[PDB]
Short mmCIF file of N, CA and C and ligand atoms in Angstrom, two decimals:
data_model
loop_
_atom_site.label_atom_id
_atom_site.label_comp_id
_atom_site.label_asym_id
_atom_site.label_seq_id
_atom_site.Cartn_x
_atom_site.Cartn_y
_atom_site.Cartn_z
N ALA T 1 69.06 60.60 45.53
CA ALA T 1 67.58 60.83 45.56
C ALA T 1 66.74 60.27 46.81
N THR T 2 66.02 61.19 47.27
CA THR T 2 65.06 60.79 48.34
C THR T 2 63.61 60.72 47.76
N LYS T 3 62.88 59.77 48.19
CA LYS T 3 61.60 59.44 47.79
C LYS T 3 60.53 59.45 49.03
N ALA T 4 59.25 59.83 48.64
CA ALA T 4 58.20 59.77 49.62
C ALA T 4 56.95 59.41 48.97
N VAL T 5 55.92 58.94 49.75
CA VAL T 5 54.70 58.61 49.54
C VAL T 5 53.66 59.07 50.54
N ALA T 6 52.52 59.57 49.99
CA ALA T 6 51.41 59.76 50.87
C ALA T 6 50.26 59.02 50.35
N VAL T 7 49.53 58.50 51.21
CA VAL T 7 48.49 57.62 50.98
C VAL T 7 47.24 58.58 51.42
N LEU T 8 46.40 58.94 50.32
CA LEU T 8 45.29 59.70 50.53
C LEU T 8 44.00 58.90 50.99
N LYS T 9 43.43 59.15 52.23
CA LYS T 9 42.00 58.43 52.60
C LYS T 9 41.24 59.46 53.17
N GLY T 10 39.93 59.33 53.26
CA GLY T 10 39.03 60.20 53.90
C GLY T 10 37.58 59.37 54.37
N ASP T 11 36.61 60.30 54.55
CA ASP T 11 35.32 59.79 55.14
C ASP T 11 34.70 59.32 53.85
N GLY T 12 34.97 59.74 52.78
CA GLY T 12 34.01 59.68 51.57
C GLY T 12 34.85 58.30 50.69
N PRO T 13 34.53 58.43 49.43
CA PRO T 13 35.17 57.63 48.49
C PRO T 13 36.55 58.01 47.97
N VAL T 14 37.11 59.44 48.31
CA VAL T 14 38.35 59.98 47.65
C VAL T 14 39.53 59.07 48.23
N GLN T 15 40.16 58.53 47.47
CA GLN T 15 41.56 58.03 47.73
C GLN T 15 42.53 57.94 46.73
N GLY T 16 43.76 57.99 47.18
CA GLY T 16 44.82 57.81 46.03
C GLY T 16 46.27 57.54 46.75
N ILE T 17 47.15 57.46 45.71
CA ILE T 17 48.59 57.27 46.22
C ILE T 17 49.42 58.35 45.31
N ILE T 18 50.03 59.03 46.12
CA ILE T 18 51.05 60.23 45.50
C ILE T 18 52.30 60.12 46.07
N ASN T 19 53.08 60.08 45.02
CA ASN T 19 54.60 59.82 45.09
C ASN T 19 55.38 61.30 44.71
N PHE T 20 56.58 61.33 45.66
CA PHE T 20 57.42 62.43 45.71
C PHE T 20 58.72 61.99 45.24
N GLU T 21 59.43 62.76 44.56
CA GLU T 21 61.07 62.09 44.38
C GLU T 21 61.96 63.41 44.12
N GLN T 22 62.91 63.55 44.78
CA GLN T 22 63.98 64.81 44.72
C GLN T 22 65.34 64.15 44.59
N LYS T 23 65.96 64.62 43.38
CA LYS T 23 67.07 63.98 42.90
C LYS T 23 68.34 64.65 43.71
N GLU T 24 68.34 65.88 44.20
CA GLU T 24 69.15 66.78 44.82
C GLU T 24 68.57 67.07 45.99
N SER T 25 69.22 67.19 47.16
CA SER T 25 68.83 67.86 48.40
C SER T 25 68.07 69.32 48.25
N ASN T 26 68.69 70.20 47.32
CA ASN T 26 68.16 71.37 46.93
C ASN T 26 67.59 71.40 45.43
N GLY T 27 67.07 70.28 44.81
CA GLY T 27 66.51 70.34 43.64
C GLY T 27 65.10 70.28 43.55
N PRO T 28 64.52 70.58 42.42
CA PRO T 28 63.14 70.33 42.29
C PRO T 28 62.56 68.96 42.81
N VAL T 29 61.08 69.00 43.26
CA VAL T 29 60.55 67.83 43.81
C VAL T 29 59.36 67.28 42.73
N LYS T 30 59.44 66.26 42.11
CA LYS T 30 58.35 65.78 41.34
C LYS T 30 57.56 65.11 42.08
N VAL T 31 56.20 65.29 41.81
CA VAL T 31 54.99 64.86 42.51
C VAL T 31 53.98 64.21 41.59
N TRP T 32 53.66 62.93 41.79
CA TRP T 32 52.72 62.23 40.82
C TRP T 32 51.81 61.14 41.27
N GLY T 33 50.77 60.87 40.63
CA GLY T 33 50.00 59.65 41.11
C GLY T 33 48.56 60.01 40.79
N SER T 34 47.54 59.30 41.20
CA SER T 34 46.27 59.60 40.71
C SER T 34 45.48 59.44 42.01
N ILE T 35 44.39 60.29 41.83
CA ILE T 35 43.32 60.34 43.11
C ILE T 35 41.95 60.13 42.36
N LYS T 36 41.29 59.07 43.12
CA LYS T 36 40.13 58.45 42.48
C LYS T 36 38.93 58.73 43.66
N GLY T 37 37.83 58.92 42.90
CA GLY T 37 36.66 58.92 43.75
C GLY T 37 36.03 60.48 43.96
N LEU T 38 36.69 61.22 43.10
CA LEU T 38 36.27 62.71 43.06
C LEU T 38 35.03 62.83 42.04
N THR T 39 34.81 64.06 41.62
CA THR T 39 33.91 64.60 40.85
C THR T 39 34.48 65.29 39.73
N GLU T 40 34.08 65.41 38.58
CA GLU T 40 34.48 66.43 37.68
C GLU T 40 34.93 67.93 38.00
N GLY T 41 36.17 68.38 37.90
CA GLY T 41 36.50 69.74 38.31
C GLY T 41 37.92 69.94 38.84
N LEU T 42 38.01 71.25 39.50
CA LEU T 42 39.39 71.34 40.24
C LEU T 42 39.24 71.30 41.72
N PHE T 43 40.31 70.72 42.43
CA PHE T 43 40.26 70.67 43.63
C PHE T 43 41.49 70.99 44.40
N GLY T 44 41.54 71.75 45.49
CA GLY T 44 42.85 72.29 46.07
C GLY T 44 43.66 71.02 46.69
N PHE T 45 44.84 71.44 46.41
CA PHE T 45 46.02 70.27 46.83
C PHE T 45 47.01 70.95 47.37
N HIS T 46 47.38 70.62 48.76
CA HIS T 46 48.27 71.29 49.55
C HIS T 46 48.97 70.62 50.58
N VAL T 47 50.03 70.76 51.00
CA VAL T 47 50.56 70.39 52.25
C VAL T 47 50.28 71.00 53.37
N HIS T 48 49.85 70.62 54.31
CA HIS T 48 49.34 71.14 55.72
C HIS T 48 50.29 70.98 56.79
N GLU T 49 50.28 71.69 57.87
CA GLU T 49 50.98 71.80 58.88
C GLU T 49 50.99 70.43 59.62
N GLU T 50 49.82 69.92 59.82
CA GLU T 50 49.62 68.67 60.53
C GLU T 50 50.38 67.63 60.73
N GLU T 51 51.21 67.23 61.81
CA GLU T 51 51.94 65.93 61.94
C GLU T 51 51.35 65.07 62.69
N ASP T 52 50.84 65.57 63.91
CA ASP T 52 50.21 64.86 64.98
C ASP T 52 49.20 63.92 64.77
N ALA T 60 42.10 70.78 61.07
CA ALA T 60 41.72 71.78 60.21
C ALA T 60 42.77 72.92 60.35
N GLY T 61 44.03 72.41 60.33
CA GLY T 61 45.22 73.36 60.37
C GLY T 61 45.60 73.93 59.22
N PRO T 62 46.47 75.01 59.38
CA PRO T 62 46.82 75.79 57.90
C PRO T 62 47.71 75.13 57.25
N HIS T 63 47.99 75.74 56.07
CA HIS T 63 49.08 75.31 55.10
C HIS T 63 50.25 75.20 55.91
N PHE T 64 51.21 74.24 55.20
CA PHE T 64 52.68 74.32 55.74
C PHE T 64 53.37 75.69 55.24
N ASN T 65 53.75 76.43 56.06
CA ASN T 65 54.18 77.70 56.00
C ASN T 65 55.31 78.15 56.89
N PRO T 66 56.49 77.41 56.59
CA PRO T 66 57.45 77.84 57.48
C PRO T 66 58.23 79.01 57.43
N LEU T 67 58.15 79.92 56.27
CA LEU T 67 58.50 81.22 55.98
C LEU T 67 57.76 82.22 56.38
N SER T 68 56.44 81.96 56.68
CA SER T 68 55.45 82.95 57.21
C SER T 68 55.03 83.82 55.98
N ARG T 69 54.55 83.29 55.10
CA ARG T 69 54.20 84.10 53.70
C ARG T 69 52.40 84.05 53.83
N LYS T 70 51.91 84.51 52.58
CA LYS T 70 50.36 84.61 52.41
C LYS T 70 50.30 83.45 51.38
N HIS T 71 49.19 83.10 51.23
CA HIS T 71 48.74 81.92 50.23
C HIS T 71 48.79 82.41 48.74
N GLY T 72 49.24 81.49 48.07
CA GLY T 72 49.30 81.96 46.51
C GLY T 72 49.04 80.61 45.77
N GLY T 73 49.11 80.73 44.34
CA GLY T 73 49.29 79.55 43.57
C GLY T 73 50.83 79.20 43.47
N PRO T 74 51.04 77.67 42.88
CA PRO T 74 52.53 77.41 43.00
C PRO T 74 53.54 78.01 42.29
N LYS T 75 53.09 78.90 41.27
CA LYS T 75 54.11 79.63 40.37
C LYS T 75 54.12 81.02 40.91
N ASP T 76 53.32 81.42 41.99
CA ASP T 76 53.55 82.71 42.61
C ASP T 76 54.81 83.17 43.41
N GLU T 77 55.24 84.43 43.38
CA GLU T 77 56.28 84.64 44.17
C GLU T 77 56.08 84.54 45.83
N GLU T 78 54.91 85.00 46.07
CA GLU T 78 54.21 84.93 47.49
C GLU T 78 53.37 83.79 47.60
N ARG T 79 53.92 82.71 48.23
CA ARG T 79 53.09 81.50 48.54
C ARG T 79 53.63 80.86 49.80
N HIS T 80 52.81 80.09 50.32
CA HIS T 80 53.21 79.15 51.31
C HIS T 80 54.07 77.96 50.72
N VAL T 81 55.02 77.44 51.38
CA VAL T 81 55.63 76.17 50.86
C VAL T 81 54.70 74.95 50.37
N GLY T 82 53.53 74.80 51.33
CA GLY T 82 52.62 73.96 50.94
C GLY T 82 51.89 74.08 49.69
N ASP T 83 51.89 75.16 48.91
CA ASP T 83 50.91 75.56 47.97
C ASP T 83 51.01 74.91 46.65
N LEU T 84 50.65 73.77 46.53
CA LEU T 84 50.67 73.00 45.26
C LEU T 84 49.55 73.17 44.15
N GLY T 85 48.61 74.04 44.41
CA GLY T 85 47.50 74.59 43.35
C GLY T 85 46.44 73.73 43.48
N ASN T 86 45.82 73.25 42.31
CA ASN T 86 44.84 72.53 42.13
C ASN T 86 45.10 71.05 41.20
N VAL T 87 44.53 69.99 41.60
CA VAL T 87 44.30 68.86 40.80
C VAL T 87 43.14 68.62 39.97
N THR T 88 42.91 68.24 38.74
CA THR T 88 41.80 68.17 37.94
C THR T 88 41.57 66.83 37.74
N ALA T 89 40.03 66.77 38.11
CA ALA T 89 39.59 65.27 37.96
C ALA T 89 38.53 65.31 36.83
N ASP T 90 38.56 64.34 36.08
CA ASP T 90 37.63 64.27 34.93
C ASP T 90 36.30 63.58 35.39
N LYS T 91 35.39 63.26 34.40
CA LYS T 91 34.05 62.88 34.74
C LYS T 91 33.68 61.52 35.62
N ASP T 92 34.67 60.85 35.76
CA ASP T 92 34.51 59.68 36.30
C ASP T 92 35.46 59.63 37.68
N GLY T 93 35.91 60.94 37.76
CA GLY T 93 36.19 61.21 39.14
C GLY T 93 37.85 60.93 39.51
N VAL T 94 38.57 60.73 38.48
CA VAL T 94 39.99 60.71 38.46
C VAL T 94 40.96 61.83 38.00
N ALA T 95 41.73 62.18 38.85
CA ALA T 95 42.69 63.32 38.76
C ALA T 95 44.10 62.63 38.46
N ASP T 96 44.75 62.99 37.50
CA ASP T 96 46.40 62.59 37.40
C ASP T 96 47.03 63.79 37.82
N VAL T 97 47.85 63.44 38.61
CA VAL T 97 48.77 64.23 39.35
C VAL T 97 49.93 64.27 38.93
N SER T 98 50.68 65.41 38.15
CA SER T 98 51.89 65.49 37.80
C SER T 98 52.52 66.89 37.90
N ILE T 99 53.42 67.16 38.94
CA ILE T 99 53.76 68.37 39.38
C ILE T 99 55.17 68.58 39.43
N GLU T 100 55.86 69.68 38.96
CA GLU T 100 57.38 69.81 39.40
C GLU T 100 57.11 70.99 40.42
N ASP T 101 57.98 70.94 41.51
CA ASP T 101 57.80 72.18 42.42
C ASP T 101 59.28 72.66 42.86
N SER T 102 59.47 73.71 42.92
CA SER T 102 60.63 74.44 43.48
C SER T 102 60.93 74.75 44.69
N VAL T 103 59.68 74.76 45.56
CA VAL T 103 59.60 75.22 46.81
C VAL T 103 59.49 74.23 48.03
N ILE T 104 58.99 73.24 47.77
CA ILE T 104 59.04 72.04 48.79
C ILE T 104 60.20 71.42 48.63
N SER T 105 60.61 70.71 49.56
CA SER T 105 61.88 69.79 49.71
C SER T 105 61.67 68.81 50.59
N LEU T 106 62.09 67.52 50.25
CA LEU T 106 62.05 66.25 51.12
C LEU T 106 63.26 66.51 52.02
N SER T 107 64.20 67.33 52.14
CA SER T 107 65.13 67.29 53.09
C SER T 107 65.65 68.80 53.67
N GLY T 108 66.29 68.80 54.90
CA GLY T 108 66.58 70.09 55.30
C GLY T 108 65.67 70.49 56.50
N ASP T 109 65.75 71.95 57.00
CA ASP T 109 64.97 72.30 57.99
C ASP T 109 63.70 72.51 57.83
N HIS T 110 63.04 72.42 56.67
CA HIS T 110 61.74 72.52 56.24
C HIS T 110 61.17 71.56 55.51
N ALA T 111 61.74 70.45 55.62
CA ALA T 111 61.22 69.23 54.77
C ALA T 111 59.89 68.94 55.06
N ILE T 112 59.02 68.53 54.05
CA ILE T 112 57.52 68.13 54.18
C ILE T 112 57.35 66.85 54.65
N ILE T 113 58.40 66.08 54.90
CA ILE T 113 58.20 64.68 55.34
C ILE T 113 57.59 64.81 56.80
N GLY T 114 56.60 64.04 56.97
CA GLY T 114 55.90 64.09 58.37
C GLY T 114 54.62 65.10 58.33
N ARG T 115 54.40 65.88 57.16
CA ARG T 115 53.41 66.76 57.12
C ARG T 115 52.41 66.12 56.51
N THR T 116 51.10 66.65 56.27
CA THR T 116 50.07 66.04 55.77
C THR T 116 49.60 66.59 54.60
N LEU T 117 49.58 65.70 53.48
CA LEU T 117 48.99 66.12 51.97
C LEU T 117 47.46 66.13 52.24
N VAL T 118 46.82 67.15 51.53
CA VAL T 118 45.34 67.28 51.59
C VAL T 118 44.78 67.61 50.17
N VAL T 119 43.58 66.86 49.88
CA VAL T 119 42.78 67.37 48.74
C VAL T 119 41.56 67.71 49.16
N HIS T 120 41.18 69.02 48.78
CA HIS T 120 39.93 69.69 49.38
C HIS T 120 38.73 69.20 48.50
N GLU T 121 37.71 69.85 49.12
CA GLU T 121 36.37 69.77 48.39
C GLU T 121 36.14 70.54 47.05
N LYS T 122 36.77 71.85 47.25
CA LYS T 122 36.55 72.65 46.13
C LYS T 122 37.76 73.05 45.63
N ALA T 123 37.74 74.07 44.55
CA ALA T 123 39.06 74.74 44.05
C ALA T 123 39.87 75.71 44.82
N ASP T 124 41.11 75.64 44.75
CA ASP T 124 42.10 76.89 45.35
C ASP T 124 41.94 77.83 44.37
N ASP T 125 41.32 79.02 44.83
CA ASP T 125 41.43 80.38 43.97
C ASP T 125 42.85 81.08 43.98
N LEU T 126 43.72 80.54 44.24
CA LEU T 126 45.31 80.73 44.21
C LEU T 126 45.63 82.03 44.72
N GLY T 127 44.87 82.44 45.60
CA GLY T 127 44.93 83.67 46.34
C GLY T 127 44.66 85.03 45.60
N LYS T 128 43.66 84.91 44.53
CA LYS T 128 43.22 85.87 43.72
C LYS T 128 41.81 86.11 44.00
N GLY T 129 41.36 85.78 45.18
CA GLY T 129 39.97 85.80 45.58
C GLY T 129 39.79 87.00 46.27
N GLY T 130 38.47 87.50 46.44
CA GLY T 130 38.03 88.68 47.07
C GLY T 130 38.17 88.96 48.47
N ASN T 131 38.81 88.03 49.33
CA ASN T 131 38.63 88.01 50.72
C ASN T 131 39.87 87.78 51.51
N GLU T 132 40.08 88.07 52.72
CA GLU T 132 41.32 87.64 53.16
C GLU T 132 41.47 86.17 53.37
N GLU T 133 40.42 85.29 53.50
CA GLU T 133 40.40 83.90 53.43
C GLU T 133 41.31 83.47 52.25
N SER T 134 41.18 84.17 50.96
CA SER T 134 41.83 83.73 49.94
C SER T 134 43.31 83.89 50.17
N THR T 135 43.77 84.69 50.89
CA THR T 135 45.08 84.73 51.29
C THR T 135 45.62 83.95 52.34
N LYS T 136 44.65 83.08 52.81
CA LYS T 136 45.03 82.07 53.95
C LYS T 136 44.91 80.67 53.41
N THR T 137 43.76 80.21 52.57
CA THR T 137 43.56 78.80 52.25
C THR T 137 43.12 78.93 50.80
N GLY T 138 42.82 79.86 49.87
CA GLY T 138 42.59 79.89 48.70
C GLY T 138 41.01 79.57 48.72
N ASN T 139 40.34 79.71 49.88
CA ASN T 139 38.93 79.35 49.84
C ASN T 139 38.61 78.08 49.47
N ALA T 140 39.65 77.04 49.54
CA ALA T 140 39.20 75.60 49.23
C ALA T 140 38.45 74.79 49.99
N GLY T 141 37.94 75.18 51.10
CA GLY T 141 37.02 74.62 51.79
C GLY T 141 37.34 73.39 52.65
N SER T 142 36.66 72.41 52.82
CA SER T 142 36.86 71.38 53.74
C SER T 142 37.91 70.26 53.05
N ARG T 143 38.38 69.36 53.91
CA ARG T 143 39.13 68.20 53.38
C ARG T 143 38.43 66.99 52.82
N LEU T 144 38.67 66.61 51.53
CA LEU T 144 38.04 65.29 51.13
C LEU T 144 39.04 64.07 51.53
N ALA T 145 40.17 64.31 51.26
CA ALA T 145 41.22 63.18 51.61
C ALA T 145 42.49 63.64 52.10
N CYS T 146 43.23 62.73 52.84
CA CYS T 146 44.65 63.23 53.65
C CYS T 146 45.45 62.24 53.92
N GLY T 147 46.56 62.56 54.04
CA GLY T 147 47.56 61.36 54.30
C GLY T 147 48.87 61.97 54.52
N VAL T 148 49.63 61.28 55.71
CA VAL T 148 50.86 61.82 55.88
C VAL T 148 52.00 61.45 54.99
N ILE T 149 52.72 62.40 54.67
CA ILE T 149 53.83 62.32 53.73
C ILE T 149 55.11 61.57 54.32
N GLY T 150 55.19 60.28 53.91
CA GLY T 150 56.35 59.56 54.63
C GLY T 150 57.33 59.09 53.80
N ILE T 151 58.78 58.88 54.13
CA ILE T 151 59.77 58.32 53.36
C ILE T 151 59.53 57.06 52.82
N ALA T 152 59.51 56.89 51.54
CA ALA T 152 59.31 55.41 50.80
C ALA T 152 59.91 54.24 51.51
N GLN T 153 59.36 53.27 52.01
CA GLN T 153 59.60 52.21 52.46
C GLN T 153 60.69 51.36 51.53
CL1 CL K 1 46.49 70.60 59.07
CL1 CL K 2 31.48 73.60 48.73
CU1 CU K 3 44.84 73.20 51.75
ZN1 ZN K 4 48.53 78.02 51.00
#
């Protein structure tokens, strides 16, 4: 098993610790943790390309989708849901991201957005790029667990 952590920080109050674990080099990745400082609602949650306003991590050159869509970016992890006091519990199992190999998400940037991801079902081309999720509230590099 390979383990990773991203520490989400932003310019506002949004912060959190997100864990990743992958038992087999080609097995599903479990993603979990809590994000605080939000407001009640749905917020886009993706792996972005940045390592060093960049696009979603997309090594296979696909269009944007929800996590369970046949057409999606590798980074497309959908939405997290925060309650009235601004806490979202993240618990995701994903088959497309990986922590090893040619397309490993290690070193890329995890992002939580200001608004909801429309899962590529929106009425414009932007929907097929970013899900119309808007600006970033918090981000953090995905690093191998120390
Ligand atoms: Cl980016
Ligand atoms: Cl907005
Ligand atoms: Cu995003
Ligand atoms: Zn995407």
